[PDB]
């Protein structure tokens, strides 16, 4: 059956990637919480 | 021209294997590990000027590093670059 995760790298990055978190106020606050929690990978880039 | 300070840092090791060996003893090509940011003009110039031979053409691939592990600790090795340097008819090394 066709499950929910149908992967695509270009949609992974355009959607949840770094240049797209940095592109706005609230994604920069996301990166700030991931750095402050101290996190090995911030976004999902590769 | 390429400066000689750049041109010394490019070639890194001769690559020893059996594909390399049959490339030397069968098709004049010496195979050698180069700098990761080394272009084909740099490798050609560096073999022209550091082994004093005449290079016909260079073919460069980039080899991806293998994820090994020690114990239960993984790690990728490291990517390197391998240059197939096709020499002319007059060569030794």
């Amino acid at each position: 059956m066709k499950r929910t995760f149908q992967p695509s790298v270009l949609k992974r990055n355009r959607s949840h990637g770094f240049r797209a978190r940095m592109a706005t106020k609230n994604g920069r606050q996301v990166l700030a919480r991931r750095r402050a929690k101290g996190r090995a990978r911030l976004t999902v880039s590769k | 021209m390429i400066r000689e300070e750049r041109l010394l840092k490019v070639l890194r090791a001769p690559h020893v294997s059996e594909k390399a060996s049959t490339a030397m003893e069968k098709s004049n090509t010496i195979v050698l590990k180069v700098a990761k940011d080394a272009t084909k003009a740099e490798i050609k110039a560096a073999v022209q000027k550091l082994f004093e031979v005449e290079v016909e053409v260079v073919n460069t691939l980039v080899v991806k590093g293998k994820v090994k592990r020690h114990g239960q600790r993984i790690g990728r090795r490291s990517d390197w670059k391998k240059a197939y340097v096709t020499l002319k008819e007059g060569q030794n090394l």
Partner: protein, 63 residues
């Protein structure tokens, strides 16, 4: 060798620069990775010696 490099001219540290890279450094990387070169400490001392020549060369040139 730190005062010894300090007392030459810019041209002469460019000469011993290119000879540290040329004669020493490259021939020991090629000699090291082809099964030869029992003496491995030479790699270290050559590398640090190029660091000295570039240091004195930056200090001599201008500021």
């Amino acid at each position: 060798m730190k005062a010894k490099e300090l007392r030459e001219k810019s041209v002469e540290e460019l000469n011993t620069e290119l000879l540290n890279l040329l004669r020493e450094q490259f021939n020991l990387r090629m000699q090291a990775a082809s099964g030869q070169l029992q003496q491995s400490h030479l790699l270290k001392q050559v590398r640090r010696d190029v660091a000295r020549v570039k240091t004195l060369l930056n200090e001599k040139a201008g500021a």
